[PDB]
Amino acid sequence: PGTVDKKMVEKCWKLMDKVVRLCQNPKLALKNSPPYILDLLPDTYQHLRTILSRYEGKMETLGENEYFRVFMENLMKKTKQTISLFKEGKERMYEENSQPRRNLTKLSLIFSHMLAELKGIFPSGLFQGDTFRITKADAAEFWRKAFGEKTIVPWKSFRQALHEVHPISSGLEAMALKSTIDLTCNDYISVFEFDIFTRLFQPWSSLLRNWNSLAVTHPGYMAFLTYDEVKARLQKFIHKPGSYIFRLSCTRLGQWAIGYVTADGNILQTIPHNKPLFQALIDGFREGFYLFPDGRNQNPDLTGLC
Amino acid sequence: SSVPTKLEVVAATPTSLLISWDAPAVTVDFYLITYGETGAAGSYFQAFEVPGSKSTATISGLKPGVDYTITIYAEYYYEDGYYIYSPISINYRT
Numbered sequence: 115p116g117t118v119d120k121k122m123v124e125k126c127w128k129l130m131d132k133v134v135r136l137c138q139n140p141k142l143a144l145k146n147s148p149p150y151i152l153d154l155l156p157d158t159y160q161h162l163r164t165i166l167s168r169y170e171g172k173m174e175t176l177g178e179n180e181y182f183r184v185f186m187e188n189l190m191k192k193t194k195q196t197i198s199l200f201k202e203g204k205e206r207m208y209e210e211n212s213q214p215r216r217n218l219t220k221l222s223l224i225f226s227h228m229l230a231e232l233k234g235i236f237p238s239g240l241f242q243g244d245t246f247r248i249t250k251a252d253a254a255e256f257w258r259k260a261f262g263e264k265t266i267v268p269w270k271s272f273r274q275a276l277h278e279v280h281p282i283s284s285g286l287e288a289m290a291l292k293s294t295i296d297l298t299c300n301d302y303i304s305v306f307e308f309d310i311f312t313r314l315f316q317p318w319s320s321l322l323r324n325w326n327s328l329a330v331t332h333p334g335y336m337a338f339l340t341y342d343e344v345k346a347r348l349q350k351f352i353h354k355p356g357s358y359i360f361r362l363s364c365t366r367l368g369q370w371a372i373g374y375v376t377a378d379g380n381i382l383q384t385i386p387h388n389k390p391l392f393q394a395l396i397d398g399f400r401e402g403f404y405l406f407p408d409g410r411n412q413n414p415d416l417t418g419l420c
Numbered sequence: 421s422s423v424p425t426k427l428e429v430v431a432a433t434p435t436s437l438l439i440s441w442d443a444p445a446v447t448v449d450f451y452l453i454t455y456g457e458t459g460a461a462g463s464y465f466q467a468f469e470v471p472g473s474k475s476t477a478t479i480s481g482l483k484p485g486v487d488y489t490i491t492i493y494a495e496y497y498y499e500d501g502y503y504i505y506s507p508i509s510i511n512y513r514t
Contacts, residue, residue, distance in 0.1 A: 195449075195497050202501075213469065285443035286475055293473040301447060 118177040118186045123162065126186060129193040130155040136200050141208040147340050148364050149222035158189070158229045164239035181235055181243050181265040181304065188300040189228065196221050223338055226364045227297035234306040235265060246305040249368075252318030257308060265305050269296065272303045280322040290330055291322070297367075313368035316390060324419060328391060332414055334407030336361040344373040345381045347408075352379055356405035358398075360391065370394075374403050392416040423448070423494040423505035429512055430476075434484030437512060440476045441492055448472030449502065452493040455479055457486050458511055484514045 134155050169176040203214030235243040243265030248254035260275040261267050282288050295311045315324040329335050339361040351357040358374035370391045373383040386394030396416050398404040407413050424441035431438035449472050456465035470477050491509040495502040
């Protein structure tokens with residue numbers, strides 16, 4: 115909301131760099147795998163450079179870009195949250211299953227999404243959030259019909275607009291939906307976030323229904339796991355052929371992946387390149403693969419989304 | 421007037437409790453939930469943390485017939501560190 119100049123950006127770099135030094139601790143021994151924070155902050159920084167070189171003379175215009183302002187203040191806020199995480203977590207950060215480590219990886223995810231959103235609104239370093247092309251024409255029309263050229267809307271605005279098209283029963287359901295769309299956790303929905311969401315739970319025609327069936331009330335939905343997290347969780351059910359899970363990828367946003375346990379004692383992953391995830395699940399259930407969501411006997415019915 | 425605004429137990433067991441609170445109109449980054457036998461000291465809680473995107477929590481290991489005091493704190497990050505709103509607490513006999 116408040117305006118960005120170069121001084122505040124340099125402060126932002128120094129804060130990120132501080133987090134980087136903290137995460138270079140050998141005793142942390144941090145993961146190779148995305149979201150790998152020690153690549154995300156360097157990469158975020160360098161894309162910020164590519165923006166600064168484009169708006170090299172035009173710095174005053176950029177400090178007023180509502181998206182850029184919101185992003186820089188949230189980036190500030192996230193990196194601060196993280197430094198303070200190291201300070202209160204303290205030595206518990208070098209034990210891997212400690213909850214501080216969980217939160218550290220959660221914010222690693224957020225940093226990752228943030229980077230993809232920045233590269234998405236600033237492709238090649240120059241703002242294109244007014245000309246962002248939502249992949250779904252049904253959703254594209256909603257976005258422009260309710261907000262027009264805007265790149266980022268406050269959450270209560272987006273709540274109201276969407277509520278007229280796809281109503282929401284409770285603030286409970288609202289807060290879960292919020293959890294899903296707002297990948298950057300700043301109380302604003304961007305055109306990028308919105309695109310991604312509207313790709314996961316298409317059709318537009320039954321957006322929130324699809325979201326409730328696949329995310330809210332499905333024991334097989336895993337949010338963001340990694341490949342080896344998928345199999346590491348399904349390693350518990352080798353004895354149970356046909357136990358299955360599906361996940362979101364932080365490297366392939368707007369996409370689904372599935373993993374299940376075969377009758378040969380293997381754990382294999384598949385992607386529904388063509389088929390909305392509910393159809394891929396339906397087919398794979400009849401096909402005898404997705405029987406046991408998360409190793410559980412009752413598998414939800416996804417007919418009635420057709 | 422606290423945050424959360426209303427706290428209740430919804431499922432019960434001699435050793436377990438299921439608690440739920442409102443969804444806020446304010447921003448919560450995380451909730452800190454505490455519990456312990458009422459009229460005891462702080463050395464005897466036992467606290468844990470839940471996202472601000474959640475409305476429910478499960479507490480286990482409580483010996484039955486004992487009066488517990490349960491508190492939810494709501495924490496928002498500021499430029500300093502996490503700060504809290506007013507808290508809400510209920511007393512529950514298993």
